[PDB]
Symmetry: C2
Subunit: 167 residues, 2 copies
């Protein structure tokens, strides 16, 4: 079977750990240590074909890091996560994508834009704004709630579809 390395990226507190732990362990973590950076395995069937996912939930400081470059180099697909009630996290998506482009020396890297915390009544990032960003990047956009599990599987499955299309 095929194996894929996925990387979950995004600003502090957008829900990267919560999304990943929901996918892997099927519960919502409300206080996950923000310094834990780890990877998780899961075997999944997507569109009838099994794949082994290795998912890195990233955590670090705002700084250049050779180790982070190595994570980007080995990563085959990236979830670009922002929170719908945090405009800064949406604006910074652009910078995170530029870092991936720099390391991988490529603009065609598999990526999915993820707008998390969709269960919250309020939002500061418009859906159209996010759809338009994803359109400009040529990538899918998925709305999620790690809290209710809405769209969690879809976000990761869609990323795998993107990696498969790229290969």
């Amino acid at each position: 079977m095929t194996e894929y390395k996925l990387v979950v990226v995004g600003a502090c507190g957008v829900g990267k750990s919560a999304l990943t732990i929901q996918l892997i362990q099927n519960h919502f973590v409300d206080e996950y240590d923000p310094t834990i950076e780890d990877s998780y395995r899961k075997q999944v069937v997507i569109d009838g074909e099994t794949s082994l996912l290795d998912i890195l939930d990233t955590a670090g400081q705002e700084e250049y890091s050779a180790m982070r470059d190595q994570y980007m180099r080995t990563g085959e697909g990236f979830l670009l996560v922002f929170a719908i009630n945090n405009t800064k996290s949406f604006e910074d998506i652009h910078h995170y994508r530029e870092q991936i482009k720099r390391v991988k020396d490529s603009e065609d890297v598999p990526m999915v834009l993820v707008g998390n915390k969709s269960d919250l009544p309020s939002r500061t990032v418009d859906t159209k704004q996010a759809q338009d960003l994803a359109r400009s990047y040529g990538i899918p956009f998925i709305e999620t709630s790690a809290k209710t599990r809405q769209g969690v599987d879809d976000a990761f499955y869609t990323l795998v579809r993107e990696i498969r299309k790229h290969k």
Copy 2:
């Protein structure tokens, strides 16, 4: 001196001809025949360095065209023009950029996003939308009015700056 092939692209009626004729001949044309596709030569000085510009003002049908592909292949920089009172023309920018990238093997092609008709108060494309689009594409955004000549020189000069950056 260096010589660059520039190509002006954009939807029907966004002001490609009006912009180009303003740059070349310094007057505003109201009813320019929409079937005329032609090139103009112009020596310009930009940041103290002279370049010869060969500028193609495009016109054609909404159809695949081998000839248009050849224009894209030889073109070195592209003005992506929309009109600020025409939302469809702004949405269509994306498709025009995709065609240029298809033909040019996904090169990081020099391009400038141009929001024309900025003199009009009938705006439907928000300025922020356009800045955000240009940011995503990694290109400059210039607002222009072929009618008042606002930004016309700047749009073309900025494209030449982008070409010079790329060829370095």
